Amino acid sequence: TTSLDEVADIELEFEKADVELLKHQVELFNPLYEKRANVLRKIPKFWPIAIEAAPSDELSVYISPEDANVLEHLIDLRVYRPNEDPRDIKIVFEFEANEYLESNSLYLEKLFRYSSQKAEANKEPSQLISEKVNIEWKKNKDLTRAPSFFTWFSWTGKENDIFEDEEELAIFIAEDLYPNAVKYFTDAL
Amino acid sequence: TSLDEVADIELEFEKADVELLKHQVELFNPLYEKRANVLRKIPKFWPIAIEAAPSDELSVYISPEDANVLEHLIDLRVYRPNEDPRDIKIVFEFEANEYLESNSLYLEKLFRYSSQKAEANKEPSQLISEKVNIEWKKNKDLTRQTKGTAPSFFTWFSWTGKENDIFEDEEELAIFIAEDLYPNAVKYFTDALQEN
């Protein structure tokens, strides 16, 4: 067992501490977020304003002028880490009634699961996989057919192992947009 | 208003970030010490990891001559030794070389989180620091450059943040060392080791 072997093993210990730390983060921030979320819902167009105020190259860049008409009715956004593996992120979008989305799809939920295999096998690592989230577009308002922001909901990451815009966006929502929504909104004044 | 309620809540988030960082420190302190003991057995680990780290955050500030000094960097440590876990101490240790006198082989730079500075242009300046004295051997002082306007990496040690600028690249570098290079060092090293 070389020093090179020791280092790789110790790195596995760091991964476990990372998971322990996220567990603690989950306990800490869940009540704060729930409490924040029910105040934010009373602030008209809080989320499209915060998204617009967020760095455009992180999100705004992917949003059509038409995508923006849908997102104008985004009334709620939430991020969860609901699984025993705290690295899985669940992102929720809720829209008020509008001209584009059938009312079944006014609530859209997407789950990104940490993958052992994908993480194990540039090399800026891709770690996340997801299931296609179905959207019922109103006839005939389907922006999924430049590309629409809403195509992000079909991404799976199971086709290759490149770290793509969709996965990076998922992390931005979870680790930046969501914690900082209030700062971004206030920046907008 | 319901926007002044958001305010009160936002202060709770701020208390929680700090609580969370405090837990992080107790959690990782011994892991870093264990890791550091093994890394010291691995020659050139730090210059190899510095080199493999993203160039746009680090090696861009490193002239070839700087790099030559860094070939002799035998240890790098980051501490959060104070009450406020946002205070960072960054420690460089060098083996003997042509550039540093023996009492500058150990270089220590502390950054304090200043809430007054942080209260006052998107990732605004939050840290303050003291100049770290470096004793250079005769005619080896890399910070002494008039022409050749690009500052040696080593001018970073004199940054204080006590008088403010628009951006503070130096602070950005400090955070990168603390929050990216040091935690991801083994990952970076491994990328190089396995660029086969």
Numbering used by the authors:
A (entry chain B): 19 to 139, 145 to 168, 174 to 217
B (entry chain A): 20 to 139, 145 to 220
Q: What do the study's own words say?
A:
Sequence alignment revealed that Vps75 is a member of the evolutionarily conserved nucleosome assembly protein 1/SE translocation (NAP1/SET) superfamily, members of which function as escorts for histone (H3–H4)2 tetramers and H2A–H2B dimers. Two histone chaperones, Vacuolar Protein Sorting 75 (Vps75) and the Anti-Silencing Function 1 protein (Asf1), are involved in the Rtt109-dependent histone H3K9, H3K27, and H3K56 acetylation. In this study, we solved both dimeric and tetrameric structures of Vps75 from a pathogenic fungus, P. carinii (PcVps75), and identified a structural basis for the inability of PcVps75 to interact with PcRtt109. Therefore, we propose that Vps75 regulates the HAT activity of Rtt109 by affecting the interactions between histones and specific histone chaperones rather than by forming a complex with Rtt109.
